[PDB]
Design a protein around this ligand. Structure first.
Ligand SMILES: CCCCCCCCCCC(CCCCCCCCCC)(CO[C@@H]1O[C@H](CO)[C@@H](O[C@H]2O[C@H](CO)[C@@H](O)[C@H](O)[C@H]2O)[C@H](O)[C@H]1O)CO[C@@H]1O[C@H](CO)[C@@H](O[C@H]2O[C@H](CO)[C@@H](O)[C@H](O)[C@H]2O)[C@H](O)[C@H]1O
Ligand SMILES: CCCCCCCCCCC(CCCCCCCCCC)(CO[C@@H]1O[C@H](CO)[C@@H](O[C@H]2O[C@H](CO)[C@@H](O)[C@H](O)[C@H]2O)[C@H](O)[C@H]1O)CO[C@@H]1O[C@H](CO)[C@@H](O[C@H]2O[C@H](CO)[C@@H](O)[C@H](O)[C@H]2O)[C@H](O)[C@H]1O
Ligand SMILES: CCCCCCCC/C=C\CCCCCCCC(=O)O[C@H](COC(=O)CCCCCCCCCCCCCCC)COP(=O)([O-])OCC[N+](C)(C)C
Ligand SMILES: CCCCCCCC/C=C\CCCCCCCC(=O)O[C@H](COC(=O)CCCCCCCCCCCCCCC)COP(=O)([O-])OCC[N+](C)(C)C
Ligand SMILES: CCCCCCCC/C=C\CCCCCCCC(=O)O[C@H](COC(=O)CCCCCCCCCCCCCCC)COP(=O)([O-])OCC[N+](C)(C)C
Ligand SMILES: CCCCCCCC/C=C\CCCCCCCC(=O)O[C@H](COC(=O)CCCCCCCCCCCCCCC)COP(=O)([O-])OCC[N+](C)(C)C
Ligand SMILES: CCCCCCCCCCO[C@@H]1O[C@H](CO)[C@@H](O[C@H]2O[C@H](CO)[C@@H](O)[C@H](O)[C@H]2O)[C@H](O)[C@H]1O
Ligand SMILES: CCCCCCCCCCO[C@@H]1O[C@H](CO)[C@@H](O[C@H]2O[C@H](CO)[C@@H](O)[C@H](O)[C@H]2O)[C@H](O)[C@H]1O
Ligand SMILES: CC(C)CCC[C@@H](C)[C@H]1CC[C@H]2[C@@H]3CC=C4C[C@@H](O)CC[C@]4(C)[C@H]3CC[C@]12C
Ligand SMILES: CC(C)CCC[C@@H](C)[C@H]1CC[C@H]2[C@@H]3CC=C4C[C@@H](O)CC[C@]4(C)[C@H]3CC[C@]12C
Ligand SMILES: CC(C)CCC[C@@H](C)[C@H]1CC[C@H]2[C@@H]3CC=C4C[C@@H](O)CC[C@]4(C)[C@H]3CC[C@]12C
Ligand SMILES: CC(C)CCC[C@@H](C)[C@H]1CC[C@H]2[C@@H]3CC=C4C[C@@H](O)CC[C@]4(C)[C@H]3CC[C@]12C
Ligand SMILES: CC(C)CCC[C@@H](C)[C@H]1CC[C@H]2[C@@H]3CC=C4C[C@@H](O)CC[C@]4(C)[C@H]3CC[C@]12C
Ligand SMILES: CC(C)CCC[C@@H](C)[C@H]1CC[C@H]2[C@@H]3CC=C4C[C@@H](O)CC[C@]4(C)[C@H]3CC[C@]12C
Ligand SMILES: CC(C)CCC[C@@H](C)[C@H]1CC[C@H]2[C@@H]3CC=C4C[C@@H](O)CC[C@]4(C)[C@H]3CC[C@]12C
Ligand SMILES: CC(C)CCC[C@@H](C)[C@H]1CC[C@H]2[C@@H]3CC=C4C[C@@H](O)CC[C@]4(C)[C@H]3CC[C@]12C
Ligand SMILES: [Cl-]
Ligand SMILES: [Cl-]
Ligand SMILES: [Cl-]
Ligand SMILES: [Cl-]
Lengths: 613, 613
């Protein structure tokens, strides 16, 4: 077959350089971008059906996730309504449904509970004033999140969600599922547990829940259990029996309607003391300017909430964009969601993002442009102004049960943890650390810890790389580690060291130790011994994988070269990239008799050059 | 001359694997290690002189740095005495002088002031009780630092000081010099400034200092200014006139002696209301167990103090070890300094490390084994029990002036910042960020911010690497970027992409964008267009610099291969290391018709294999 034949001079870097010479309408993405391009002839019907279905789903989801946040039911309707309108303009995606997404809602509720506890606020009971304070804190956090998102959009730094690695995303998702389960289990049992704010909050909440389980409400617990069983069974049947009924069954909506009708018919509120929403405001409240003074106490939480909400939004947007063959602008997603969160925070809402289930409902029911979003917003509006009184007898345990039933996919990544461990130990470590940190910390603090742990794992992987003592495969130009192939011959009086990482301070110390181990000695000790009195003659450094190089690395390279030259040992560098050589030359490496003539193209010109002497 | 000639088959990874087959008395380092090995015949005289000189220096330095800490003068004597004895046993180094090192002292004093303010403690004035509380807090912090250091010694994690990069070390050093200058300027002016704890503390301290400058004491200011001028002038003359007097002149000791004698003679305390130490305890106080309850409020500070103190200790130890041709055990340095800090914290001392100036004094005066340290400790002892009354009239402004005069070398790295910027922009950015963060934050918080900023810079450098579209140098096996050499020929219908970094999630997105830019299109869009209807035929991925690889990277590689195979474009991988291929095979890469036959040794076997078809 084909053979590897090449005839050329031995080029050093100096010789190679000598012979081969070197050397305005998108920030506000208009609705006019697609409204004139709209397809009125047929798209209206699909948009209307999809919007009605996803609005029916989104009213329920906003009401349910308003319990995850520490705000009364009814403001979830606002959080489902306002962000859709203020995303219809700036939004790039045309399939995602904008709403609470109970993970962001639970982080918001954790912030609100930390900044407005029951005992800290009410010292008399002042339900109305406490609810007003909780709503105001939620609106302030939403406005801060929107400001952060808009700032990130202005700076065009949309690559930050790259840092949200899949292992840490999965660990954070499982931990958030655990937190949501704990909160909604507190809700369904109708047990009054004092809210623990800080570290080990979830564990203390569980301890108090199982302590006060004796005070559980039978009606609320039974309703929640029955709702969970019905929803999960219907979802399982739909997953199995999937060839028919292409649209997913809106089991949650029907379950909530039946529960509300039954609770209105037999009046669980007064007969069994059931926990119902008991209050939904009618009409739209006037806007209020959030107090910016609280911004200092929400920074570490607003940053994490903005990052998580945007990551979920673009995740769902990209999942549906690769399906419908279009691209979503990430920086414009910053802009759209930041403006949306600011607008919603002014109008008394909590942080807005998209939900995978709601987006799936919207798309599977004839998903088309964001007009379906507008129809969903109109449905939420008519629920706000007309259907507010009808949903009063509905139990909060039903909404919590709906959320718990939806938590299954988020609970299932414990199954993929072991295969992650088998595939790559550091990824499983990232997963487990993110999960545990998000459990015994805040969810925001857990996210920040997971991000910095991912950064630390990258730093450790580049700091302790693979390094090999290379010898030649006979009659070829293939150099491989002498301990791996058993047919590798060691050349005459020269050691070849491949350091498979960029050289920086941690890699400085690692590379010094690796050279000392490879050559079997160190230059300083032998030089001092020879001075007091008064095996290897060359070391080739295979730097093919050296990506970058800093001033500490350049200093280390100069020190290594000088120390080995002191004991008549020549150090040659091979396979260095052009930019690394430029870094060397601008860092002052080529001074004091270096002259770039000890740099070869690969680790075979070095050996040939040695054999010439 | 020598020519590059090689004849071999074209090996893929599969073919290459087919033909070439693969596959108890040191933790307590005894004084008995060198006491029997001691050289009594001649080493006693050198040890005695060096110990007396360095003890005379260390008494003054401990007294001066006790002002950097928020403890009364006299406990610096204990901090200079006890750690030396408890380091004489476990210490590896035999040249460093154990003591306060005013940077660690200032961080300790910042912690103590934050945990014991004047207004928070004294509400009546209770100088004695406030001093006792400050001393107890300092001892608690010292014990916590020693516990952390001993734990780090048990875990053998001595590579952590590698993360203290030279740029961030320099920035932190300059910021610490600024903080020390501010504190000692507050001391010399004898102006009562309320202590600002937290962020922008140094700026507020300066504002109040220049506001209250009208209350300055003329005698203290003049004494401090004269001491500074004398010390700096003598140091400059010694640096210039250096051929004679090999031992550095102990100008600080003579200056302090003269100042104390003058203040005793003419009684500045009552005549000019000068700020003198006014109190030094006689004898050794009994030990007290620090209250562990405060450990929760010192963790982020104790960690940074331990890291900084150990880093300084091993820095000086290595500087003198490479001079005297010996090696110091870093993990045993953890053990020794942790035991020393625990012992000192029990006996009412603040955190102990080494000082470069004191170590230079000890070594230059006949530096020998740690017996000189014991002699210095004895000198400090006789100062504690006898010379305590003699040093009472000494002004604290003199000690602050001594520290300010010594601050020059720490202030001089602003000169090396611009050359750092010229050499490597990221290193200068690390320097400036560390300096600014340590300025507008705590010094401990500044150190932590600098550490995680260095980690972030490493992550960013590996996340946005150099990537090149490679073409062949004619009649050779040299492939270089087509835009750099102007003699590079692009092969027939194939693009070669070198991605000079390990592939991870950030690098996943970067590499996808790089491939899309190089080939001039993306696989998904063209595949979808062809499906709706119903330039490049190969892409070689030069992965020579790919160091590691994670599950996200493996998934990305599989997705890229499948997407390009969908449009009849073959993707070949070349120059991959053996461990990266092992990572691929254990991550499930070689499934669904991959079979390792698309992996070549270098980017010349790929081109030859293409030319075979
Ligand atoms: C882009 C990259 C990421 C950016 C991240 C940005 C984080 C910003 C943090 C901001 C910060 C530190 C600033 C310095 C941080 C240095 C870190 C160095 C790190 C080095 C790598 C501000 O610190 C000070 O906090 C004061 C309050 O304590 C605040 O209020 C004071 O003045 C007011 C008038 O101005 C006056 O009205 C008010 O009365 C005063 O008190 C001050 O204004 C403010 O300066 C800390 O505050 C954050 O908020 C909470 C405070 O309690 C705290 O909440 C947590 O509570 C749960 C437990 O209970 C926990 O479980 C939750 O999680 C979380 O809800 C957060 O934890 C904390 O973080
Ligand atoms: C190896 C790797 C590194 C390890 C680093 C270890 C850091 C440990 C920090 C510990 C910590 C956070 C824990 C969670 C951190 C999560 C981080 C996530 C990061 C994600 C990227 C504990 O948080 C809680 O703090 C409470 C006090 O507030 C403390 O006391 C409570 O219970 C007691 C009875 O137990 C009871 O007696 C007490 O009355 C209670 O109040 C609790 O016990 C404790 O749990 C924060 O505490 C640290 O100490 C100070 C507190 O004020 C604070 O001091 C600063 O003040 C200056 C300004 O004034 C500032 O300028 C200085 O710098 C610094 O002096 C620190 O800043 C803070 O850090
Ligand atoms: C500070 C903030 C919080 C940080 C918390 C800690 C975060 C980091 C956590 C630690 C890393 C955890 C990685 C995942 C655990 C193993 C998962 C797995 O595959 O199950 C295997 C079980 O095998 C084991 O569990 C043993 C190996 C892992 C534990 C080693 C000792 C830990 C010492 C540290 C204490 C069996 O599955 P297999 O595939 O058959 O093999
Ligand atoms: C606030 C933040 C502050 C900064 C961060 C602080 C935290 C920093 C955290 C960093 C800790 C990193 C630990 C893991 C290092 C790499 C592990 C690995 O397999 O890589 C290499 C081996 O690794 C080594 O050889 C390392 C040295 C060995 C001894 C280590 C101590 C254990 C003693 C054990 C004692 C016995 C009990 C091998 O890699 P490869 O060649 O690819 O194969
Ligand atoms: C949050 C915690 C605190 C973080 C603080 C910020 C930390 C990071 C700081 C920023 C990086 C600072 C690097 C050092 C500054 C330049 C030093 C230098 O060589 O002097 C050159 C001056 O040239 C300049 O100063 C212009 C270039 C630098 C500034 C660009 C805009 C900054 C926008 C950001 C606002 C001239 O010298 P030359 O060699 O002739 O060239
Ligand atoms: C708690 C922790 C939380 C998570 C971390 C949070 C912080 C995350 C921080 C990360 C921020 C990293 C910024 C620097 C990125 C690399 C810079 C560089 O030269 O590398 C490459 C270019 O860089 C790019 O191409 C990048 C994309 C370009 C646009 C970027 C936005 C600016 C828009 C400007 C708008 C105009 C105004 C080039 O590298 P090379 O090939 O080697 O040459
Ligand atoms: C890019 C890097 C970003 C790093 C961001 C770091 C954010 C942390 C700042 C300070 O840390 C928090 O401070 C709170 C101050 O209140 C603590 O609450 C505490 O407040 C109570 C009262 O002090 C304590 O008793 C409780 O332990 C606890 O809830 C909380 O635990 C602690 O985490
Ligand atoms: C490897 C990752 C390591 C992460 C380490 C994170 C350490 C920070 C934890 C909490 O942060 C601190 O909390 C203090 C709580 O007291 C704040 O003091 C504050 O206390 C006063 C009272 O609340 C405020 O008014 C002042 O702004 C300020 O001094 C201080 O500013 C803030 O930094
Ligand atoms: C389809 C789903 C949503 C219907 C939910 C309706 C709810 C309100 C119904 C369904 C099951 C019912 C419970 C069934 C049995 C009992 C025991 C009886 O001694 C008191 C009433 C009580 C506790 C009922 C309360 C109301 C209840 C919880
Ligand atoms: C509310 C409290 C109780 C939640 C506690 C959650 C913790 C304990 C759980 C959540 C996910 C779990 C991990 C999921 C999967 C695996 C792989 C298998 O080899 C068992 C261990 C390991 C690594 C688990 C360890 C325990 C774990 C981290
Ligand atoms: C070890 C390997 C072979 C297990 C393979 C099956 C995996 C997917 C299953 C089997 C049993 C499961 C564990 C059973 C019980 C618990 C406790 C609870 O906290 C949930 C997670 C955890 C820890 C599960 C994680 C996933 C798990 C480990
Ligand atoms: C990858 C890096 C960034 C992770 C850093 C995590 C660190 C800062 C966190 C993780 C868990 C935290 C601990 C959790 C619980 C407690 C108990 C409390 O009474 C004092 C604080 C203390 C002791 C915390 C100190 C800080 C801590 C150790
Ligand atoms: C060698 C060094 C350390 C000697 C220091 C001695 C100190 C105590 C001496 C040196 C210079 C002296 C000052 C010189 C001039 C004056 C002005 C006079 O109207 C009041 C006394 C006053 C303010 C003196 C106070 C004491 C003083 C500050
Ligand atoms: C107490 C307060 C006033 C201290 C403030 C210190 C700050 C402002 C100082 C300390 C060191 C300084 C840097 C030192 C050196 C250089 C290089 C030169 O190109 C000027 C800018 C730059 C980058 C300086 C910027 C300002 C700087 C960061
Ligand atoms: C820009 C290049 C050419 C300067 C070369 C000379 C360097 C070493 C000198 C010249 C002038 C110096 C600056 C003069 C003034 C200040 C303000 C103060 O905060 C100290 C640092 C700083 C910022 C100095 C840093 C170092 C400096 C920039
Ligand atoms: C490289 C990474 C780890 C560095 C992270 C540094 C971050 C966490 C620090 C650096 C400077 C800090 C800010 C300094 C000053 C203030 C003003 C105060 O009123 C509120 C907090 C606030 C706004 C701080 C928030 C946190 C902050 C932005
Ligand atoms: Cl979902
Ligand atoms: Cl849900
Ligand atoms: Cl020094
Ligand atoms: Cl000094």
């Amino acid at each position: 077959s084909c053979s590897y034949v090449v005839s050329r001079p031995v080029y050093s870097e100096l010789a190679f350089q000598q012979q081969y010479e070197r050397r305005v309408l998108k920030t506000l993405l208009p609705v006019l971008d697609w409204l004139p391009k709209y397809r009125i002839k047929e798209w209206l019907l699909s948009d209307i059906i999809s919007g009605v279905s996803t609005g029916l789903v989104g009213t329920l989801q906003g009401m349910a996730y308003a319990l995850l946040a520490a705000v009364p039911v009814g403001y979830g309707l606002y959080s489902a309504f306002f962000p859709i309108l203020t995303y219809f303009i700036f939004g790039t995606s045309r399939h995602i449904s904008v709403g609470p997404f109970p993970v962001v809602s639970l982080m918001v509720g954790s912030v609100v509970l930390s900044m407005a506890p029951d005992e800290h606020f009410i010292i008399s009971i002042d339900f109305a004033a406490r609810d007003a304070a909780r709503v105001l804190i939620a609106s302030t956090l939403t406005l801060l999140v929107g400001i952060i998102q808009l700032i990130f959009g202005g700076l065009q730094i949309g690559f930050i969600v790259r840092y949200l690695a899949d292992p840490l995303v999965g660990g954070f998702t499982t931990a958030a599922a655990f937190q949501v389960l704990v909160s909604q289990l507190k809700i369904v049992l109708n047990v009054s547990t004092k809210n623990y704010n800080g570290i080990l909050s979830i564990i203390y909440t569980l301890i108090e829940i199982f302590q006060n389980i004796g005070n559980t409400n039978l009606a609320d617990f039974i309703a929640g259990l029955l709702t969970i069983i019905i929803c999960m069974a219907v979802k399982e049947l739909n997953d199995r029996f999937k060839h028919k009924i292409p649209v997913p069954i809106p089991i949650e909506v029907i379950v909530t309607i039946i529960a509300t009708a039954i609770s209105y018919a037999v009046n669980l509120e007064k007969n069994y003391n059931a926990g119902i929403v008991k209050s939904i405001p009618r009409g739209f409240l006037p806007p209020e300017i959030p107090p910016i003074s609280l911004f200092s106490e929400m920074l570490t939480a607003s940053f994490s909430i903005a990052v998580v909400a945007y990551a979920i939004a673009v995740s769902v947007g990209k999942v549906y964009a690769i399906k419908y063959d279009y691209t979503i602008d990430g920086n414009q997603e910053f802009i759209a969601f930041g403006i949306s969160n600011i607008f919603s925070g002014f109008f008394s809402c909590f942080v807005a993002t998209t939900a995978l289930s709601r987006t799936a409902v919207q798309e599977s029911t004839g998903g088309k442009t964001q007009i379906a979003g507008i129809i969903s917003a109109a449905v939420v509006m008519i629920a706000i102004v007309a259907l507010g009184k009808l949903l009063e007898p509905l139990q909060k345990s039903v909404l919590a049960a709906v959320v718990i039933a939806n938590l299954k996919g988020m609970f299932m990544q414990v199954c993929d943890v072991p295969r992650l461990w088998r595939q790559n130990k550091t990824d499983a470590v990232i997963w487990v650390f993110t999960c545990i940190a998000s459990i015994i910390l805040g969810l925001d603090l857990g996210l920040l810890a997971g991000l910095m742990f991912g950064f630390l794992t990258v730093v450790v992987r580049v700091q302790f790389p693979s390094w090999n003592s290379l010898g030649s495969i006979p009659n070829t130009d293939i150099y491989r580690s002498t301990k791996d192939y058993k047919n590798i011959e060691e050349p005459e009086g020269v050691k070849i060291l491949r350091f498979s990482s960029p050289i920086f301070y941690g890699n400085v110390d690692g590379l010094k130790k690796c050279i000392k181990s490879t050559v079997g000695f160190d230059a300083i000790r032998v030089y001092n011994k020879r001075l007091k009195a008064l095996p290897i003659h060359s070391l080739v450094l295979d730097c093919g994988a050296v990506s970058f190089l800093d001033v500490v690395g350049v200093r280390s390279l100069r020190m290594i070269v000088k120390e080995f030259q002191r004991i008549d040992v020549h150090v040659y560098f091979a396979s260095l990239q052009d930019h690394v050589i430029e870094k060397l030359e601008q860092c002052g490496f080529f001074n004091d008799s270096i002259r770039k003539d000890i740099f070869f193209l690969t680790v075979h010109d070095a050996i040939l050059h040695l054999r010439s002497q």
